[PDB]
Design a binder for this molecule. Sequence first.
Ligand SMILES: Nc1nc2c(ncn2[C@@H]2O[C@H](COP(=O)(O)OP(=O)(O)OP(=O)(O)O)[C@@H](O)[C@H]2O)c(=O)[nH]1
Ligand SMILES: Nc1nc2c(ncn2[C@@H]2O[C@H](COP(=O)(O)OP(=O)(O)O)[C@@H](O)[C@H]2O)c(=O)[nH]1
Ligand SMILES: [Mg+2]
Ligand SMILES: [Mg+2]
Lengths: 423, 155, 424, 494
Amino acid sequence: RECISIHVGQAGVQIGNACWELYCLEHGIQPDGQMPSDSFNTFFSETGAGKHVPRAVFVDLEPTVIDEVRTGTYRQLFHPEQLITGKEDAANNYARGHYTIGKEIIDLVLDRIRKLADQCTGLQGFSVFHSFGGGTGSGFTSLLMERLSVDYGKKSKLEFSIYPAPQVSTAVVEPYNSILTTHTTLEHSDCAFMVDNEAIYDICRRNLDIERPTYTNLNRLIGQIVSSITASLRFDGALNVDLTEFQTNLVPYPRAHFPLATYAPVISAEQLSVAEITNACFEPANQMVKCDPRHGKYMACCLLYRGDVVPKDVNAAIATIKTKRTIQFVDWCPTGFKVGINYEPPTVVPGGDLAKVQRAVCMLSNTTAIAEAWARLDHKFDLMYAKRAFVHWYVGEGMEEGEFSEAREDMAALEKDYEEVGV
Amino acid sequence: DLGKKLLEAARAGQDDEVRILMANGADVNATDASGLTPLHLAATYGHLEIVEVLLKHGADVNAIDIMGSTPLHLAALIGHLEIVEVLLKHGADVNAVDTWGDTPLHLAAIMGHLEIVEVLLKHGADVNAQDKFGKTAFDISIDNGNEDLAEILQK
Amino acid sequence: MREIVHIQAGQCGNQIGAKFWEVISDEHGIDPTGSYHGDSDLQLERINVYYNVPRAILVDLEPGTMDSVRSGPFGQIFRPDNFVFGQSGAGNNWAKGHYTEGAELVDSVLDVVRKESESCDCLQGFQLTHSLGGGTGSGMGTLLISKIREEYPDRIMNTFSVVPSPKVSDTVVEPYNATLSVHQLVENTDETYCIDNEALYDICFRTLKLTTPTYGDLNHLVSATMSGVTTCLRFPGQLNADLRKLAVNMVPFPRLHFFMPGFAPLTSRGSQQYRALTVPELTQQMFDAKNMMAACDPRHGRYLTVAAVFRGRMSMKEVDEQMLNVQNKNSSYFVEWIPNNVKTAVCDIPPRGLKMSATFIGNSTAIQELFKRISEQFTAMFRRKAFLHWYTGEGMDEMEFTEAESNMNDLVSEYQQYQDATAD
Amino acid sequence: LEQRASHKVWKARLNAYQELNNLFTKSSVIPNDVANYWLDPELFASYIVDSNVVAQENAIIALHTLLEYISQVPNVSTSKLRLQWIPPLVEKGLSSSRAATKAKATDCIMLLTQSDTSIQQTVNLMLPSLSNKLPRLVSSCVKCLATIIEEFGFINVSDINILLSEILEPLPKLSSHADRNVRSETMNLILQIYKWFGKELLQELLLEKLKPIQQRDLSRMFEKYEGTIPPKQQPRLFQWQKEQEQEQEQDPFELLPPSVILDKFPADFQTRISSTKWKDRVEALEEIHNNVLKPVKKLAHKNQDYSDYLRVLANVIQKDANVQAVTIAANSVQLLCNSLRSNFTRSYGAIVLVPLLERTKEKKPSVNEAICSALDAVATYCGFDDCLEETLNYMKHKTPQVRIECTKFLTRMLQGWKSDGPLQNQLLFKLLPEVTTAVLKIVNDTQPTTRNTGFECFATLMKLVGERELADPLEKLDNLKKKKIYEYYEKVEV
Ligand SMILES: Nc1nc2c(ncn2[C@@H]2O[C@H](COP(=O)(O)OP(=O)(O)OP(=O)(O)O)[C@@H](O)[C@H]2O)c(=O)[nH]1
Ligand SMILES: Nc1nc2c(ncn2[C@@H]2O[C@H](COP(=O)(O)OP(=O)(O)O)[C@@H](O)[C@H]2O)c(=O)[nH]1
Ligand SMILES: [Mg+2]
Ligand SMILES: [Mg+2]
């Protein structure tokens, strides 16, 4: 029944910390690994000495971030063989992550994954956490995804991508890296949840009331929403109980496998109703990817409630939105909203700016308006590639220039794929 | 592709494994290569329970293919009287035309399905409809020696 | 990506080089004996980058320069082995530094470079300071660069090259030497900071009101600029952290990697303005061409990429606002087809003397003005074939001058192309 | 699926026949021991008579491409094949009623006919089938006999007299046969014998014995024939004939007296070349080059040891820090190799080879000019003696420049590759093991200008050794790199 998590690049690794911090609070697991208290062993394994170890691998082509992971509060939680580091980073270059540097460590990484899969009996698949604009996040992940489709080809793989945003952007070439990994990882991913760092920035400035958010601010907010999606796998709910069901419910087209996630409520630490939070799921301000679903057709839509929730309140709030708003669906869809509930309360971090809420909801909806997000990257990409800007860096690290065009055509074809569904 | 397994099942006639594939959200109107939906295939090979399953889940009763054949065309060709009345009851096109100019009445008359001919006629079939060569359903009975059909066409 | 090996070659190379070590030794809290007397962790956080004692190699054909460094203030700290010096001097002959006399010594230098690199956890790249109008700093430096480029092709090459000007030395062979050296740098280095003596004089003379600037006066402007651009590398920070990431976000086309540096506020040798500048004032020293270390007008060209480094305690909110402001209020001066091409970073530790400061590294196409000046002086000299027997005697071919002339003109044309480019 | 070719189920044999047909088109041409459908020809003799008409036809088209994959030397074992194969081919392939089953059987016999030296051994085997029950077999096998002649003809036939009698003997009975087709298709065979030596011969031997109406139609057929009594040129040649034609389609000034230069050397030479002052070394080399080497045009082959002088040219080309002293030295080395051809066997060639390859690192155009031109000299006079192995070694070297230049070197040499012998040269002994594994390291380099040299150095390789033999590592390569390799393949010659 088990599931393995992988974290690539600083983004993956540092969001991983926020998620496994939040997983251990939700499961009452201690920083040293003990537990004074199954469905949760989908994510954790067990030592003979009563210690609960995550089924996770941490990867970065550079020690600094994982060194802090290896000496952080949760240093005892992970086995040292799970934390893998190189020396030379990818330097915001997809080519180095995928071709030049990534090939030097890919075999060691795949080997340490086999050690966790050998401990498992009925392995389900893989969760993958990585940035778009990062060199490691883009290049190495796309490589690792290719190789996991070989050594474990007959099982699922899910992405957690960090969509770039100029407000926290570290590189000019982040459009390049995003397009390049999304091209080569498209065929090897069954489902992929994008996270626009701008929306997370906007949300933290408005609803968390922070002037200039830090990465901890964004990661904590993100970790809450990741927990909402993986809650079904860790507590044995009714909906989305295994990795296949994510494809079943949300993916009616292998290529178009990019759901929009909306999370309410985000309450500052300085209660709402079931109906009020469900209306906020159709408010663009609380989306994780900045677009307008009103300009698009829904292919699917799931609601994952958790907390003090009465099943009848849900059905009322559903009928309200299905009658008092005009949510356009495609004609070849069931058009019925799937629902699942988990009565455990949303855990926050002690000290966090996010407050404990009585109930919460996370709406996963594969709307065609998310094509707007791809259009923004494609445009930025076109401006630089029209002059072949920064292209020599990529071509100089083992990459053919044609791969740029082959990726761009695959992105243009995906934009047409989103258009034809919604007309 | 889940839309391709639903065509494999609806054709070969595994009634049970349609419900399995459809419970996984398979495309009810998934086109193969020549534009044939599963409703086309089930209406060709006589799988009545699979036709009624797809129709009530939302199957285009008047879907055409690359050659303009509706499922009512194919049902009236092979001679599946049980399916013909199911399609017509689900709003089938009684006077649909295909690329060769034939209506379902042409096909049921050529193949000698006298019991299906009378059903189509009573659902308002065009007895004077012509094909490419310019022949009606009545001309086919004259040309083919069928006097059992000539009388059933003027009723 | 940790350690950086430093090199200084030629008279000017060791002059501004030692000045640089004086500045950042203080900033990191190291005394001339080589002992930490600081009072902060941000000082020793990334001391492993430039120190072990500096990771610096001193080179010159002129043996006198040996003593001019050791008899300097921080001259005691450099490793004795890392001094590599020839018997005679190059005498403003680029060929003597690159082919004959400078070539005989370059092996001894590479032996020490190897030694310092051997004991590095993870090398980043290299760092050379030198003048382009000389014979040793230009000829042997560019020869050293290529020789390292081929022995360490997996590393970054970053140079601090100073441009000759008639206002600082009336030697007429400098256009030759600088042109030949630019023909090398465009092919051999990842990034190059263009320090123009023309602009250093014009700043000390007109802005600082010094009637006769000395080398020390010009070297003060340089050493402060170097600590500013290397602030990201020497202290903890998210943006433009290592050499490769910097060049990745600064150089869109491999040949066009010549940065026009500039910083603020402009101070004299040990004068204090008594009034600390504001954030919007610092920001308005960017387009202010009187703060550019290269003698070019940014108004006459377009910025491809820009890196800003604000040092001191100040509002990160206000810096973001002012930078976002000045970009769009001059939107016709920043290239449109490179989005988010300006990147800002802050460091809390200011430079010594100043409460606040701001350095402005820019890849501006206006830099073509600088290369125009060198080429016109080169061509006037070359069309009358003056002093050619110097270079040809040392094994050089007359053809080389034409190639370097043509290669620099292609470099000028390239800058003009992207200046007139449109996104449409 | 190797043994599945004789499986009980028909659709399982049908695969193995397609598997084989794909093998004989995709196999190595020199040939795998797996291609053992020559030494046991009973195998395909069984396959051609398959108990299923559909799997039969697929066995014949596999035999067809097998029987043209054999177009490579050495396959002198075509005698055994015609004995084993054409009787099944005639008996049940020509016999067949299937359109395509017949057409490929005839085409098969074509290829077996031109494997032979002449037509007699094939004709002699397919003659008995004229006396078979089934008319459509004798109807067809008289048409096939008639078109092994009109396209080949009687040449290199030991005893034509015995052969003409053996094929003229049944012609009376065939021309009086019941079947219309057997008769109609017998007049064609008569014409094709007339078309090669008639009318006089067969009017006395044969035409006399046919129906009068028949010999009229044959005369009417001879008028419509235009062209000389024996055809000037055959519409098809045999294997030994076409190769001879291709080989048909496809004084040295060196006699001058030899000059001696040892006496030319000066006393102040050894210390000058081994001096610390650069200009001493330069002038030393520059003098013996401009004064002593450049004038001459042929050096002394007999009893002159230059391996003392050449090992000091190597010492400078490798280790000397003066790039100018290197340039003038490699030009000296070239002069020795140029004016003294056939001398650099091993000791001389090997004394300067590995130093020269080290110094390709130099990027100054004039210097790369001289070093490479010298490496071209030793290559043109040491063929592939020590260079082939050591050029590869330095393609694996760490310096980027030595990779692109030593790979360009293999490219230069490969264009002038014309070693003697049909096959089994030093290139093939180490082709896949070493050459290709090393060229791929260049093709997959981090740098584009490096990769782009490999793309030529792989397209110049395919040109030499067949774009089909190397299709295995072609597949493992990117589709994107493939179209760059092909770009050069179209524009590259030898
Ligand atoms: N939300 C969020 N975004 C992050 C985090 N860390 C990095 N990013 C974003 O990810 C993008 C690329 O940065 P990184 O992921 O750190 O790059 P990397 O994967 O480590 O690759 P290299 O550092 O070049 O080896 C940047 O635009 C950052 O804004 C994080 O912890 N949380
Ligand atoms: N800014 C600055 N420029 C210098 C200094 N010394 C020399 N130069 C310039 O560099 C050029 C002379 O080259 P130099 O370095 O002295 O010759 P080298 O010893 O062979 O490298 C002239 O254009 C000088 O103006 C210095 O200390 N500071
Ligand atoms: Mg990182
Ligand atoms: Mg000097």
